[PDB]
Curated annotation (Swiss-Prot), chain A:
Disulfide bond annotation, renumbered to this chain: none
Residues of the full protein shown: 420 to 471 of 574
Protein's UniProt name: E3 ubiquitin ligase TRAF3IP2
Tissue: Widely expressed.
Signal sequence, renumbered to the chain: none
Disease field: Psoriasis 13: A common, chronic inflammatory disease of the skin with multifactorial etiology. It is characterized by red, scaly plaques usually found on the scalp, elbows and knees. These lesions are caused by abnormal keratinocyte proliferation and infiltration of inflammatory cells into the dermis and epidermis. Candidiasis, familial, 8: A primary immunodeficiency disorder with altered immune responses and impaired clearance of fungal infections, selective against Candida. It is characterized by persistent and/or recurrent infections of the skin, nails and mucous membranes caused by organisms of the genus Candida, mainly Candida albicans.
Curated annotation (Swiss-Prot), chain B:
PTM text: Glycosylated.
Function: Receptor for IL17A and IL17F, major effector cytokines of innate and adaptive immune system involved in antimicrobial host defense and maintenance of tissue integrity. Receptor for IL17A. Receptor for IL17F. Binds to IL17A with higher affinity than to IL17F. Binds IL17A and IL17F homodimers as part of a heterodimeric complex with IL17RC. Also binds heterodimers formed by IL17A and IL17F as part of a heterodimeric complex with IL17RC. (Microbial infection) Receptor for SARS coronavirus-2/SARS-CoV-2 virus protein ORF8, leading to IL17 pathway activation and an increased secretion of pro-inflammatory factors through activating NF-kappa-B signaling pathway.
Disease: Immunodeficiency 51: A primary immunodeficiency disorder with altered immune responses and impaired clearance of fungal infections, selective against Candida. It is characterized by persistent and/or recurrent infections of the skin, nails and mucous membranes caused by organisms of the genus Candida, mainly Candida albicans.
Subunit annotation: Forms heterodimers with IL17RC; the heterodimer binds IL17A and IL17F homodimers as well as the heterodimer formed by IL17A and IL17F. Forms complexes with 2:1 binding stoichiometry: two receptor chains for one interleukin molecule. IL17A homodimer preferentially drives the formation of IL17RA-IL17RC heterodimeric receptor complex, whereas IL17F homodimer forms predominantly complexes with IL17RC homodimer. (Microbial infection) Interacts with SARS coronavirus-2/SARS-CoV-2 virus protein ORF8.
Positions spanned in the full protein: 672 to 712 of 866
Sequence positions bearing Phosphoserine: S37
Protein name: Interleukin-17 receptor A
Domain of life: Eukaryota
Tissue: Widely expressed.
Lineage: Eukaryota, Metazoa, Chordata, Craniata, Vertebrata
Length: 52, 41
């Protein structure tokens, strides 16, 4: 889904949603991948989109 | 004594109606992202 996910993320960003995805937050994710993931897993307010 | 009482039919008087409210999004688009940098030899 990587190719489609790029379009989906662009669509979300244009509509003003702050989408966190690995390919875009590469610099921050690079510091600590597991910490990066747990950042969005812990937060109850973050809506997680599952690309089936 | 047939004049004791009468049968009565009940109706709901003050009926009212209304339309459903639906939401829509105005306009759509997508700005392209940027990517890439050249390799070297």
């Amino acid at each position: 889904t990587a190719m489609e996910v790029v379009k989906f993320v662009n669509f979300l960003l244009v509509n003003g949603f702050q989408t966190a995805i690995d390919i875009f937050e590469d610099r921050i994710r690079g510091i600590d991948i597991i910490k990066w993931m747990e950042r969005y897993l812990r937060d109850k307010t973050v809506m997680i989109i599952v690309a089936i | 004594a047939e004049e004791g009482a009468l049968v009565a039919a009940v109706e709901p008087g003050p009926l009212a109606d209304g339309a459903a409210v639906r939401l829509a999004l105005a306009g759509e688009g997508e700005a392209c992202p940027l990517l890439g940098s050249p390799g070297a030899g």
